[PDB]
Amino acid sequence: GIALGMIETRGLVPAIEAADAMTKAAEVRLVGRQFVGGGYVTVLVRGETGAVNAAVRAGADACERVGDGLVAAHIIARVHSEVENILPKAPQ
Template sequence: MTSSKASTSSTTSSTKALPAAATGSTRSSRTPARTAGRSTTARSGGSSSGTTTRRSSAASGRSAGAGRSGGGSGTTRPSSTPATPSMAPTVHGIALGMIETRGLVPAIEAADAMTKAAEVTMVAREFVGGGYVTVMVRGETGAVNAAVRAGADACERVGDGLVAAHIIARPHTEVEPALQGTEATRRL
C-alpha cells in the first residue's frame, strides 16, 4: 500500500489509471504494465489519460469475456432463443433492413456493401418483377442501420438503382411469414 501512495504522489496522471487497475482483481497484474508503458502519452495530455484508461479496461474486458464460459452476452442469446422455438431458425437478429433496387447489379452491390459494413446476415433476395430486386438483412438495430446506409450509398454510386431503403427495428411476429423469401424467379 505504501508503494501505491508513493506512485500517486509522484505523478497525477497515474492516479487516474490506478482506479481502473484496482477494479479488476484478476487483471491487476497485467494492467499496471500497460499503464506504465503508456505513461508518457498520459503525461503529455490530460484527455488522453482518460482514453488510455478506457482502452485498457476495454481490452481487458474483451479478454476476460472471452475466457469466461458464462459472460453477459452468452446468457442473453440462449434466453431469447427458447422463447420462440418455432421462429429461432429463421430469425437472425432483431432488426430488419430492406433495400429495393432497379436491376440486379445495384442489388448485388448493395448486398455486398451491407454485409461488409456491419455484422448482419442476408436473409432474403427477392426478384419482385419489372426489374426490381429487394435485399433483406437481419441483425442488431445499430448494425442494420449502418448496413442499410452503406448499401444505399453503394447502390447510388452504381447508378440510378436505389428505389427504397427502410429499417424496421422490431418487426412483429405476425410479419415474419411475409418476410421469408419465395426464391421464385419471375420474368416479366
C-alpha cells in the same frame, strides 16, 4: 438480432452491390434476394439495430449510382410476428 433492413433497387446488379456493402459494413446477415417483378429486387438483412442501420446506409451509398438505381432503403427495428411469415428466413 431481429432488425430488418431492406434495400430495393432497380435491377440485380445494384442489389448485389448493396448486399455486399451491407454485409461487409456491419454485422448483419443476408436473408433474401427477392425478385419483386418489374425489375425491382429487394435485398434483405437482419441484424441488431445499430448494425442494420449502418448496413443499410452503407448499402444505399453503394448502390445509388450502380445500374438503374436505389428505390428504397428502409429499416424496421422490430417486426410484428405476422410480418415474419412474409419475410425470407435464409437466402434461398
